[PDB]
Design a protein around this ligand. Structure first.
Ligand SMILES: O=C(O)Cc1cc(CC(=O)O)cc(-c2cccs2)c1
Ligand SMILES: O=C(O)Cc1cc(CC(=O)O)cc(-c2cccs2)c1
Ligand SMILES: [Zn+2]
Ligand SMILES: [Zn+2]
Length: 590
């Protein structure tokens, strides 16, 4: 293991030799520990509160889920216990027949994914353009510095020699340059999966990359039309910690489709930073805070570029294998058998494969599968053997499915079919409201002006206008926030890091115009392109469903809040100053 990780540890060791030691009382049981060095503590036990949002969402001040979200630990104290709970585990090795099935499925899945697209290297100017269009943190400063690009080249020359000196995953400007450069190199070799949308629904069949939250519901409604059993959506208990050495080696087969110069750099990312890794993790001690140097040959680093794609790939593979078991193609005897017949797996993949991929919606560890029947509910031998053990359910207890696509959980959401006042149907995203309000009430970090705060608030308000307008409490709170925040202030900072977010709310353009573009114009499932002229024609969930999904509708405190909301708007306005404000409350029934 050391002839791959040695150089990186050697560099950390030399750089921090002042405080470098072997802390014999380290908590690593499954990870190989190398040593520690003293550092300053990072993060907090709490989260900064967005006063603009809080002042306009008073009934949620006394709501447990909302209070819970204001917390979330990021200190070495919080970092160490979260690591213990899942990261410090070992997945047993899948059986020889399981390993063969995964291999046959991996090979076929990669050829299917690359039937039209061809892998390619990603560039310095692609990364640069991305870093620029993200902020508009000190990554823009590094990208602008030619000295950063020089280290990148030095590291790349080591990678071409099959060596690694600075690619360390984290749980002066020199170390920041080494991190952003490690991320650039991985972006260079594996970014094409994201940048050239390999997991789009059109290229992957099961995939949903680049579709967006507003489309996921319509995708599930279309899967519901496919004849078969119920729709299954099983969560995996810590997916990234369940990525085996066999998963990594199967994921690596993509290098076969690459040009020699691309294959060489991609092989370097896989072999040196995925199938081997050097990790940095903050740990508190009775004599301060230390940064530990750990390593392992398996599991997925959640921060990395290829994480979404390679998780989508392995889940598609895992679900195809579970479908084969459901159909009686794979038996218990087959999974135990090294010499299992490749023929029947190839026969099933070449005749039923694509059709079987079309029965699924897969986004990283999130899957929705509509098998040909319900034998799938009890097809658990391979899923458990592959290491993809379902969360909070006895290992051999049959999976429970849904016969209504609207009850199906996918990507922290459920989806509703709404009938508009004109009779047209919408399929909308939904989640418990407390999670939405609770998240909007969190401002990111310290040293933030009221201006930056009001703009983040405006961003959350407009995201709600576009994605969650059907939630009565959120349309009101959204209008209230947009009334309290000056009209020309541009929503700045992201509301989410979600791959399903396309941030159409990050504008000063009229939200009803934007709504019409997303839900009517650009909506492939909206045949009638007649615009909606008024927010009064933009539908809500039925009162019942709105209440079932967390609404305070019908409560006194909520009616009080709704009644006295111009007072709170005025309070926020007076504190902001003599700016230009537009009153968005008239756009509502009140
Ligand atoms: O159901 C609709 O179509 C009308 C509608 C809209 C709204 C939204 C707003 O607050 O202006 C709220 C309510 C309710 C507040 C208390 C009980 S029901 C009803
Ligand atoms: O990616 C996920 O797992 C699901 C998810 C989660 C969240 C919450 C968060 O990231 O803070 C927000 C969203 C979005 C809100 C609008 C468009 S996408 C989606
Ligand atoms: Zn490296
Ligand atoms: Zn709902």
């Amino acid at each position: 293991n050391m002839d791959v990780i040695g150089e990186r540890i050697k560099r950390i060791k030399e750089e921090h030799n002042s405080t470098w030691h072997y802390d014999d009382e380290n908590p690593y049981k499954t990870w190989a520990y190398h040593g520690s060095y003293e550092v300053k503590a990072t993060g907090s036990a709490s989260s900064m509160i967005n006063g603009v949002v809080k002042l306009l969402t008073k009934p949620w001040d006394v709501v447990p889920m909302v209070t819970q979200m204001a917390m979330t630990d990021t200190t070495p104290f919080g970092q160490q216990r979260v690591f213990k709970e899942k990261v410090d585990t070992r997945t047993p090795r899948p059986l020889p027949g399981t390993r063969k099935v995964m291999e046959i499925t991996a090979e076929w899945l990669w050829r299917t994914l690359g039937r039209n697209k061809r892998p390619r290297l990603c560039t310095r100017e692609e990364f640069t353009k991305k870093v620029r269009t993200n902020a508009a943190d000190s990554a823009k400063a590094a990208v602008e510095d030619e000295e950063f690009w020089k280290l990148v080249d030095r590291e790349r020359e080591l990678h071409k020699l099959g060596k690694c000196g600075s690619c360390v995953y984290n749980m002066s400007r020199a170390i920041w340059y080494m991190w952003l450069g490690v991320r650039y190199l991985e972006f260079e070799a594996l970014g094409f999966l994201n940048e050239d949308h390999w997991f789009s629904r059109e290229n992957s069949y099961s995939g949903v990359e680049g579709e967006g939250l507003h489309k996921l519901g319509y995708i599930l409604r279309d899967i519901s039309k496919i004849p078969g059993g119920a729709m299954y959506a099983d969560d995996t208990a810590g997916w990234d910690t369940r990525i085996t050495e066999d998963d990594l080696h199967n994921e690596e087969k993509i290098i076969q489709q690459m040009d020699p110069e691309h294959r060489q750099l991609a092989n370097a990312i896989f072999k040196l930073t995925y199938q081997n890794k050097v990790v940095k993790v903050q740990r508190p001690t009775p004599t301060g805070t230390v940064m530990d140097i750990i390593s392992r040959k398996d599991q997925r680093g959640s921060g990395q570029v290829g994480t979404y794609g390679l998780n989508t790939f392995t889940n598609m593979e895992a679900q195809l294998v579970r479908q084969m078991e459901g159909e009686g193609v794979l038996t218990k005897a087959d999974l135990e058998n090294p010499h299992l017949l490749e023929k029947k797996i190839t026969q099933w993949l070449e005749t039923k494969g694509v059709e079987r991929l079309k029965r699924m919606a897969i986004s990283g560890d999130d899957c929705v599968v509509k098998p040909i029947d319900d034998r799938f509910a009890n097809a658990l031998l391979a899923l458990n053997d592959m290491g993809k053990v379902r969360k909070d359910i006895p290992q051999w207890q049959p999976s429970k499915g849904w016969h209504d696509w609207q009850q199906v959980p996918f990507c922290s959401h459920h989806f509703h079919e709404l009938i508009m006042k004109d009779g047209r149907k919408l399929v909308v995203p939904c989640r418990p409201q407390d999670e939405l309000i609770g998240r909007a009430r969190i401002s990111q970090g310290a040293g933030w002006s009221l201006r930056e705060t009001a703009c983040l608030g405006k961003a959350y308000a407009q995201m709600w206008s576009l994605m969650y307008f059907h939630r009565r409490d959120l349309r009101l709170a959204s209008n209230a926030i947009c009334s309290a925040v000056p009209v020309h202030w541009v929503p700045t900072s992201r509301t989410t890091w979600s791959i399903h977010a396309h941030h159409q709310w990050m504008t000063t353009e009229d939200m009803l115009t934007v709504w019409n573009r997303v839900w009517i114009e650009e909506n492939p499932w909206m045949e009638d392109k007649t615009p909606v002229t008024t927010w009064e024609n933009v539908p809500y969930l039925g009162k019942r469903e709105d209440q079932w999904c967390g609404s305070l509708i019908g409560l006194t405190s909520r009616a009080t809040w709704a009644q006295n909301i111009p007072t709170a708007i005025q309070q926020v306005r007076s504190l902001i100053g003599n700016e230009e404000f537009l009153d968005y409350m008239p756009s509502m029934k009140r």
